[PDB]
Symmetry: D2
Subunit: 186 residues, 4 copies
């Protein structure tokens, strides 16, 4: 899988999502070659890239134009993006112009989370999966609540990752900030 350092960063744009988290998002998403996915809040483009290479069509969204831009760039350095539709703007609105989806990953919920999830429910093909990435405590609560209220069986997994940094004296463990994944039954 593509490591975090082989991504082009932009200060105003957050990400890339830790590879270990991306790794898991894919396990949960169960990507299929005929699937249509939407990555709300694509940011650096980490999820989009991984999805890009495993599904039929990927619809990437972000309010931040810098994000849309960083994702396009990262799509290129890796040679992907033909099956990717980039959409700059407000998520709810962009979501209404998309076909139905088999997979929905919601990252930077930009505080319109509840609205985004309702819409996504309405377009979720039978057997579809939703995976919300949470950094803020509040998102972890809101996601769980919304999905539950939308009738899904909800689950949550928090990941605390530490990677070793080679120093001259030895190997010190460096932490990543905790990331939660709220996901619906398959």
């Amino acid at each position: 899988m593509i490591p975090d350092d082989e991504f082009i960063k932009n200060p105003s744009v957050p990400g890339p999502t830790a590879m270990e988290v991306r790794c898991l998002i894919m396990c949960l998403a169960e990507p299929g070659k005929n699937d249509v996915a939407v990555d709300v809040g694509c940011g650096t483009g980490g999820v989009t890239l991984e999805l890009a290479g495993r599904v039929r069509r990927v619809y990437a969204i972000d309010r931040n134009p810098e994000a849309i831009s960083t994702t396009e760039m990262n799509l290129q350095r890796h040679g992907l993006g033909d099956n990717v539709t980039l959409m700059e703007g407000d998520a709810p609105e962009a979501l209404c112009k998309i076909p139905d989806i088999d997979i929905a990953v919601v990252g930077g919920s930009g505080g319109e989370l509840q609205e985004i999830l309702r819409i996504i429910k309405d377009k979720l093909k039978p057997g579809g999966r939703i995976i919300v990435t949470a950094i803020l405590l509040e998102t972890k609560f809101e996601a769980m609540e919304c999905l539950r209220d939308l009738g899904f069986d909800v689950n949550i997994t928090e990941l605390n990752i530490a990677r070793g940094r080679a120093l001259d004296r030895g190997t010190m463990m460096v932490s990543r900030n905790p990331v939660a994944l709220i996901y619906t039954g398959v």
Copy 2:
């Protein structure tokens, strides 16, 4: 991916490895359909199952006959195991009868870790990967040292996973014991 609960457990046999960990072992392994992998210390069979479905050949090992047994069982309930050679016995010895490998995962090192690693170095096809699973503090150190001494560029990632348990009052976070993955450059 197959969740932890859809595995058949045996008291004397440890595992299955947390799905989140298994998920990452695959990312790191970079399974290819023409690859030959060896899962030293297959235990409940978690890694074996995931590798079974992505590579050409899998050679599963464990001193514990109960493990070998539980792995066979789990292979069946999921419909895999044709490309799997089960080998009960001592790792070093069983290793010597195997072809060369593209991927080497070492779980229950059974304290003969250093010997196992040397052997594995000697059968590692160019571009091969080694991934050691560590639960004991000492294994984390030994793996890093050995692989380094065997001339590999070593890395380590520790995972601390908490999953939510639905109670009547709410969702409580339940921790898994920390698991480290020492791995060699690709």
Copy 3:
């Protein structure tokens, strides 16, 4: 400080709170010899014991009579409890009969958290501290919200602790479930 094993447990009663968490609760509470504290949801009595030996007066509460009982016992085996008022019953009600407080620790919020906090606000002496112990995801959210809505500057620290268990083969790290502490400025 008193370690977890030197406490008398009761199945129906949760606790004791990890020593590492108790240790920090004290750091945040800044116990003073002329302070009056209330420990809502005293359970096994861990926080109560620690507070007992550092402040003037301690008011311990719990709906569970088994809790009230285990705390009294634990107070004895360690020779403390003279400055401790045990109150069995419903927190909101027992809170109304208490003097003002310098320190308030809320553990088993028993789902009446929001009410408890209001009441506690109303009896908090200037320079008083509130520290909420959270195990459920929902509590972490609710505490933060409430305290914020009550006009406090809120903070949160989550603790993930692993202690080594001596085995014959080596030292394995055993995890404790994550604990959050939501606390107000001093």
Copy 4:
């Protein structure tokens, strides 16, 4: 207790130790007013400050002159340091000039860990405590081994701490790198 931000930093000098870790070091140290402690590798001076205010005599050491300097400064801004002997130089040598100790905290082992511990064993008053702070994976292993070989009953606790950072959108959890404390029985 003094928070991390109320410490003066210096780039070449690491630290201060996270307050949550310092908090625990004290728990384990069980500081007494007539105790004599040594803080090997004082760095920014965090532990030294805390010990300064609770024991009779503190002997602070560091190869790094900047460290010795930052510590003195930090001692001042907080009005402590009269009972503190600062010693710049090589730990083993500086240790030989000190009286016996009740408490020994070893932070920046500067790779002479094994020698430092032997020496400390030789000056440890009956009922004395040793606490080694570990950042590097290798230190965790070395400390455990040494202390064990020196005949102590050894323990280890790893701390993974996340504190919330108030953002405009919400509260994000920010991790601290894992820290292990290897300590001897009391």
